[PDB]
Amino acid sequence: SGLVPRGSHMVGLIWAQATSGVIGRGGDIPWRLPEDQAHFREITMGHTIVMGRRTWDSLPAKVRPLPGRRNVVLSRQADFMASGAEVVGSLEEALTSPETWVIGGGQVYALALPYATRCEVTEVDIGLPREAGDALAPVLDETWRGETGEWRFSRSGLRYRLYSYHRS
Numbered sequence: 001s002g003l004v005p006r007g008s009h010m011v012g013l014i015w016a017q018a019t020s021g022v023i024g025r026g027g028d029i030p031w032r033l034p035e036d037q038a039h040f041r042e043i044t045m046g047h048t049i050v051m052g053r054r055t056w057d058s059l060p061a062k063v064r065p066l067p068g069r070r071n072v073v074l075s076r077q078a079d080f081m082a083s084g085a086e087v088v089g090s091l092e093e094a095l096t097s098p099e100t101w102v103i104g105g106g107q108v109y110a111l112a113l114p115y116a117t118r119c120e121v122t123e124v125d126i127g128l129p130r131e132a133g134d135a136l137a138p139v140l141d142e143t144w145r146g147e148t149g150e151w152r153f154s155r156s157g158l159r160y161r162l163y164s165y166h167r168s
């Protein structure tokens with residue numbers, strides 16, 4: 001199907017996770033998956049994106065701010081320099097755009113989850129176990145519903161699938 005009705009406010013979370021729920025370590029995403037970059041890009045294009053400061057830090061710098069999207073960086077550092085983005089000091093202000101995609105990281109997903117009505121999740125079939133210091137994906141309960149895509153191979157051979165969850 002791929003349809004998801006929307007209301008006067010849409011707050012979406014988008015992430016890619018290992019089976020174990022690892023999304024981040026050492027300030028990076030511990031795999032590369034071209035189809036997921038393409039998916040992340042097309043979903044978020046033209047929208048406001050919200051990210052924690054550490055996620056802004058983890059962006060390759062030549063791709064800061066992410067092109068074609070309104071970049072919003074959540075930080076408690078009032079003097080934080082984020083060239084080409086805006087810095088907001090609270091989650092409330094961050095989610096004021098009528099359509100917002102939260103693009104990371106572990107901290108901000110957790111805080112934003114209660115307001116979210118879509119989760120766009122790439123499951124990467126990689127057996128990375130949770131380690132000390134890892135950033136972790138939220139656990140979705142059964143208020144979330146939607147569609148699970150088929151397993152696909154990237155040309156590299158890495159296997160992945162897409163979940164598109166929503167709720168009222």
Ligand SMILES: NC(=O)c1ccc[n+]([C@@H]2O[C@H](COP(=O)([O-])OP(=O)(O)OC[C@H]3O[C@@H](n4cnc5c(N)ncnc54)[C@H](OP(=O)(O)O)[C@@H]3O)[C@@H](O)[C@H]2O)c1
Binds near residue numbers: 103
């Ligand atoms: N696989 C994926 O889909 C994916 C996507 C995005 C990121 N990641 C990874 O996840 C990791 C980063 O995640 P993380 O959980 O460490 O950090 P994060 O959520 O990106 O950023 C946390 C920072 O956000 C700010 N913050 C958090 N809550 C706030 C609030 N209520 N008000 C104001 N500011 C707030 C603070 O910034 P200040 O310290 O500046 O105050 C905090 O240190 C990296 O490894 C990144 O590569 C993975």
Ligand SMILES: CCc1nc(N)nc(N)c1OCCCOc1ccccc1CCC(N)=O
Binds near residue numbers: 029063
């Ligand atoms: C594509 C990764 C990703 N994937 C999903 N599915 N949700 C996310 N929030 C998500 O994270 C978006 C923030 C980090 O983006 C990276 C990180 C490493 C390499 C590439 C990118 C894409 C953007 C760019 N031009 O660099």
